[PDB]
Amino acid sequence: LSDYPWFHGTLSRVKAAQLVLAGGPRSHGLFVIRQSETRPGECVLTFNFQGKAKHLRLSGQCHVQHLWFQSVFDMLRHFHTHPIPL
Amino acid sequence: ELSDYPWFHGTLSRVKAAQLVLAGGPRSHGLFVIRQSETRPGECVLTFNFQGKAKHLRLHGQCHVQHLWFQSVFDMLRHFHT
């Protein structure tokens, strides 16, 4: 879990929102997985949806779940390597 | 709501969902579909293509936010598969 670039351990709710909102609506889709501050036993999926920060609670398929997030991340990375020419 | 999204495929079977996301092989990496489970009536399943293989992930009040998440992933597939 800690080996993935999209996992940000103890990152707070507030800081996670600021992180995914940097860039405003253009950062649509940007996300981070972090440990919940209020519910220690869980993780939270924080993402940018059209310029607004959303928080999705994530409470025997953890590996497959990681594969999914990794796939989504591969898409974000793609935007950050093969940007749309101006 | 759910049924209004292009990535939701209602009754789609496990087998047909795998076939769908696997068309294109490794190149369809990331393609996914949300469908109703056929072994657990109340839930949905997230079926996606990971490097050429089909994966099935079993899926409060955060259903709407959940939809926004899947819609955002769907929005990035285009460029990604282009």
UniProtKB/Swiss-Prot annotation, chain B:
Effect of residue 35 to A: Abolishes interaction with phosphorylated INSR
Residue ranges occupied by any SH2 domain in the UniProt entry: 7-82
Family: Belongs to the SH2B adapter family.
Impact noted for substituting residue 55 to N: Abolishes interaction with phosphorylated INSR
Span of the entire protein shown here: 403 to 488 of 621
Locations listed in the record: Cytoplasm; Membrane
Functional description taken from the UniProt entry: Adapter protein for several members of the tyrosine kinase receptor family. Involved in multiple signaling pathways. Binds to EPOR and suppresses EPO-induced STAT5 activation, possibly through a masking effect on STAT5 docking sites in EPOR. Suppresses PDGF-induced mitogenesis. Involved in stimulation of glucose uptake by insulin. Involved in coupling from immunoreceptor to Ras signaling. Acts as a negative regulator of cytokine signaling in collaboration with CBL. Induces cytoskeletal reorganization and neurite outgrowth in cultured neurons.
Name of the featured protein: SH2B adapter protein 2
Domain of life: Eukaryota
PTM (free text): Phosphorylated on a tyrosine residue by NTRK1, NTRK2, NTRK3 and INSR after stimulation of the receptor by its extracellular ligand. Tyrosine phosphorylated by JAK2, KIT and other kinases activated by B-cell receptor in response to stimulation with cytokines, IL3, IL5, PDGF, IGF1, IGF2, CSF2/GM-CSF and cross-linking of the B-cell receptor complex.
Primary gene name: Sh2b2
Subunit details: Homodimer. Interacts with KIT/c-KIT, SHC1, EPOR, PDGFR, VAV1 and VAV3. Interacts (via N-terminal region) with SHC1. Interacts (via the phosphorylated C-terminus) with GRB2. Interacts (via its SH2 domain) with EPOR, INSR and KIT. Interacts with GRB2 after B-cell antigen receptor stimulation. Interacts (via PH domain) with VAV3. Interacts with NTRK1, NTRK2 and NTRK3 (phosphorylated); after stimulation of the receptor by its extracellular ligand and subsequent autophosphorylation of the receptor. Binds INSR, GRB2, ASB6 and CAP. Insulin stimulation leads to dissociation of CAP.
Annotated tissue distribution: Detected in embryonic brain, spinal cord and cortical neurons.
